[model samples]
Target: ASEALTMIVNLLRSQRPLQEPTVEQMRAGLEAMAQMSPLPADVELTTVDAGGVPGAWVRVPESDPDRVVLYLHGGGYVIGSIRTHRDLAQRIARAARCRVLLIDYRLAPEHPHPAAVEDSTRAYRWLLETGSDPKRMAIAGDSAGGGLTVATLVALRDAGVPLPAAAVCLSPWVDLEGIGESMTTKAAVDPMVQREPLLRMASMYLAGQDPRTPLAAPLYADLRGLPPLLIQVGTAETLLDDSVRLAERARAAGVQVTLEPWEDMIHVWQAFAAMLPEGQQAIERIGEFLRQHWQ
Candidate 1:
C-alpha cells in the first residue's frame, strides 16, 4: 500500500512548470529527460525504414527477433520521437522478450490528423512486407500513441490486413474533446496532463478535422473487430475515464479488455520504472499479458 509513497515524494520534487511553451521547447524537454536514463549493456539498436516511415529497432539479448512490439511514442502526436521513446521501447522489449520497433511517426500542427494514422499503418504494413509474423506482434503506446495504436488497428482491420496479437495503452487520450468526467475530478491531482493542454494539442493535431473522428479519437471508433486490449491508467490522472470507457466499449464490441486502474499514480508512470516500483510491476504485467496472448 505504501510503496506508492516513494513515487509521490519523487513526483513532488519533479513538478513541471505551467506555461504555454513552444512545441520545440516541449520536444527538447522530453529528450532532455530521457537523457537521464542509461541503456543497459545488453541492449542493441538499429535504424530502419518502416515502409516509408522512419523508425528504429530496440532489442535486448533475451528479446525474440520474431516477436515484435510496434511502439508509438506519446507527445500529443506533436513532440515525441525515436530519440525520446527509444529507451522506453527498449525497456518494453526487455520486459516482453520481444523486439521493439519504435516508429517516428509524422507529427501534428504540421503533419496533422490522418498523417499520423497513415504513417503508423504504413509502418505496420511494412512490417508484414518484411516478413514479420502478424500473430507474433502487438501494438503498444502511451497517451496519444495509445489512441493511435487503436486507430492503426481499426484501419488495418478495415483494410482486410491481418491483426496483431493485441494492443496496450498507457493513459490513452481517446477523447479529443476533453469530455471525460475525470477531466474535472482529477484535475487538481494530475500534475503531468491537464485538460487545457490536451485541448490545445487535440486541436493542433486535428487540424480542423472532426474532434470525434474515429481514427483521430478512437472513443468514437468502431472497436468491434480490434484484438485484445490492455488499457492501463492512473487514478490521479485526468484521462482515467478514457481508459475506463474504452475498456467498456471494447468489451461491448466483443473484444477482450484488461483495464488496470492503478491508485495514486500519474500519467505514463511506466516510463518512470527506474525509480518507481509500481512502474516496473506494471511493465511485467504487460509482459505477462502479451505472452499469454502471443502463445
Candidate 2:
C-alpha cells in the first residue's frame, strides 16, 4: 500500500493540467473516476424527502434519535451522486454512532450555481421538519460537497434558519477562482486530481455563470456566524490550500474550526475507506468531531 501510494503521489506531482476542461468532458471524466472506489456493506438506505429534490440518505444500521448527519456528495459541481458516496456515509455513521442523511443536490452545467445551495438547504430543512433537532444535526461532504457544507451554513445564518451544530469539509474544492498556490505546488503530490483537470471543472461549472458567486467560490464569502467546522485536506492535493484558508477564515470569523492535513493522499481520500488506512482514520476523526460537538 505504501509503495503504491508513493507511486501514485509521484505520478500526480509531475502531471499538472495547463487549463480546465469542458463541462461535458469533465462530467465524463469524473463519472469514470467515481467508479474506482468500492463501498462498505453496513449502510442502510433512505429516499429523497427534500421537497421535490432528487436525493438519498445513508444511515447507520440502526437510527439514533439523538444525532443525525446531513451529507452532501462530491463530484466537483457536476459529478458524483448519493450512490457514489453511500459507503463513505456509512463509515461516518458507524464511527460517529449516529444516523447520516446524504443529500443528492443538483449538479452544475445544468442546474448551475445556487441550485445546489437551494437543494442542500431544502434537504437540511426537511430533516429539521421531520423532528430532528437542529442543535444535534451535523453537515458534511467531500470535494464539491465539502464546499457546499460551508455554503449551507452561510445560507442558514444569512436566512435566520436553524443551523446544524457543526460541519465537516473533506478535501473540499472551495475555490472556483483557482487562486490557491497548492494547485501547482501540490500538483505532483496529489494522487487523484491534477491542477488543470480540477480547474477545468471549476471553469466548466462557472461557464455562463458568475465564478465569483459566493456559492461557487465560498472562500470569498462572509463566514461570520457559521457553525463549528472540521476541515480535512490532503497535503498532496492542489486544493489543500483551500481547506487551510477556509479554516483560518472560519476561525477569524469566530467559528470553531479544526483543520487536518493528511499526508500523501488523494482528494477526500476517505472515499476509499474500502482499503486506505488513512481513509479509516479520517472517518474516525470525523465521527469524533460530530459526537463531541453534537452531544
Candidate 3:
C-alpha cells in the first residue's frame, strides 16, 4: 500500500497545475479524469428525476434496493456531473451494498450559491415523499459535494425534515474562505488542487453572496441537531483543516462526528479505487460506518 500510494502521488504530481481556461474546459477535465476509474461489473446505472434535478441511480447486484445513498458530486460547485462521478458512486454502492442516487446539482457563475444546496435538499425530500424510509437513507459526496452533505443535513434539520441515518464526506471543502491552515501547510504536496483555483471557483459559486454563509461553507454552520457524520480527509490536501475544524465544531455542538485523516493521501483519493488500494479501503470503512448507524 505504501509503495503503490507513493507511485500514485508521484504520477499525480507530474500533472500539476491543471489549468482550466473556461468552465467548459474545467468540466471536460474533471469528466476525463473521472472516466479513468471504471465501474464494477454488475453495477447498473439508470437515469432518474431527483425532484426535477438531473440524477442517476447506481446499483450493484448485491445492493439492497431498500437502502439508498443520495450522492452529490464535487467540482467546486462549478463543474462535475453524474457522468463524471458514476464510477465513484458505483464503488460506494458496491461497498455499502446499497443503491446510490448521484444528483447533478446546478453549478455556479450561473446558478450560484444555495442552488446546489436547494437541489440536494429537494432530492432528499423527493426520496422521502416517494416512500423511502429516512432510517435506511444516507447522504455522501466528495470535495464540494462533501461540504454539501453537511449543508443538506443542516438544511433538512432547520426545515423540520427528519434527517437520514448518517452521512459521509470525502476530503470535504467546507471552508470557502480558503482560510484553513492546510491551505499553506499542504500546498507543497497536494497535486490535484490549489488555493488560487479553488478561490476562483468559490468566487464564481458565491457570486456576490458572503463566503461565510453556512450553506455555502458548512464549517460556519450550526451543526447541532445534525445526524452522525463520518469525515474522511487526506493528509496531503489543502482542505485538511476544513475537515479537522469541522470535526471540532461538530463535536462542540454535541454532534456525533468521526474524523479519519489518512496519511499521505491526496484530495478525494477514494475516487481512484481502480489504482489506489487506499481508496477501496476508505470506502470499505465508510460502508462499515454507514451500516453501523443503519442497523
- Model 1 superposed RMSD (Cα): 1.6
Q: What is the lDDT of candidate 1?
A: 0.88
Instruction: Estimate the overall C-alpha local distance difference test score of candidate 2.
Output: 0.77
Residue range with the least summed lDDT across 10 consecutive positions in model 1: 11-20
Off by over 4 Å in 1: 1-20
Residue pairs whose backbone atoms clash in candidate 3: none
lDDT of each: 0.88, 0.77, 0.89
Candidate 1 per-residue lDDT, tens place, 99-164, comes to 999999999888999999999999999999999998999999999999999999999999999999
Model 3 Cα lDDT, one tens digit per residue, 1-295: 4567886787677644246778888888777777777666687889988789889989998899999999999889998998888988888888888999999899998899999999999999999998889999999999999999999999999999999999999999889988988999899988888888899899999997899998999989999988899999999889999999999999999999999999989988887777888998999998899888899
What lDDT is obtained when candidate 3 is compared to the true structure? 0.89
Alpha carbon lDDT at 120, candidate 3: 97
TM-scores for every predicted model:
0.96, 0.89, 0.97
Per-residue lDDT of candidate 2, residues 126-160 (tens digit): 77777889888999988889999998888888888
Question: Model 3 off-target regions past 4 Å?
Answer: 14-18
